Amino acid sequence: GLFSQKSFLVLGFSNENESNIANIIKENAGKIMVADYAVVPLLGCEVEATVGEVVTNTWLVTCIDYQTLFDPKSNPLFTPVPVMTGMTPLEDCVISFSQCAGAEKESLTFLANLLGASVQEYFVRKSNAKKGMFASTHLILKERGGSKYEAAKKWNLPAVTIAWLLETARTGKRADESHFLIENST
Amino acid sequence: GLFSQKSFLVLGFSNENESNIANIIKENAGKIMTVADYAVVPLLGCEVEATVGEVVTNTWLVTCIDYQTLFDPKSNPLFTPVPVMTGMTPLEDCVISFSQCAGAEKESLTFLANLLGASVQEYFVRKSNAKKGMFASTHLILKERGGSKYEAAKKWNLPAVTIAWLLETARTGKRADESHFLIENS
């Protein structure tokens, strides 16, 4: 199995949610209970007991979706994400994603909503009431490339990195888009 | 600069076209011409008697610039001259849509498909609609298993093929067996 000889500890989830995670771990050959991992919510919770390392269910679900065991340090959603709660810095924003799929995208969309943005599947230049699309204010992505990125450049709309989202999240303050343009990412 | 420490020959274009291309290379820190790193040639290619590191296409040049990345010319068959069996039109009754392709790569595939006698359509529809000005589609050309159009082709029983199908058609002068290039087998 993938989680062969790996012990886990699920923390901070609901009565049911704990069980679903515990299930999917055994279903890929891990053991439940010093533990190799401690699975906690995206926003992290109370971890008293000493573990190998604290990872998120986002890491977990991602790992299984690729059948690969990723390093938790290789993506900031894989470990608990700092958020300044109570803040809605993204209040008036309408966000699209590009180059993000599955669990990662569910999590980013989670954080975006948390900050009070609205998220849409479609990157949209002009609001169309009949179609149900509101004009987008931000594109969030990973590399330069693809049709969403090309529309952002053509429409003069900020196409920023994921770190823009996570920094706003950390400080509860809207990150300066110009400091996070994918246009300038190396 | 992106093309910094790189030297270029610009061969095969009209006077006005190569002036533009040369300026673009210069604007990206490249030098125009010893042995040049690159000879930029049109997609279909041209005589290059000078000796250069490698011969590359305008599609390479533009993509590279669009994504501010120095892609290895071997990473995409459109980056180096594409062999076409001249004057042959084996796709004369085809109506082709592309999925998952953007920008210069897409402008180039479009050119090729038209060149082979195909007609290229923005919208993938199963049935012609004269009022809307759209023709029934016959092929979908895409990069990976997934997305709206891919599902539609599966539903409509239309062939969904990798780009290699298109290029193999061009090289031979003959319509390649769609069943040897299905997206399901890649």
């Binding site: 180059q99 479609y122 949209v124 002009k126 169309n128 049709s147 969403k148 | 990976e144 997305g147």
Partner: peptide
Amino acid sequence: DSDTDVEE
């Protein structure tokens, strides 16, 4: 990006 998802 399996879908283009670009509008206007």
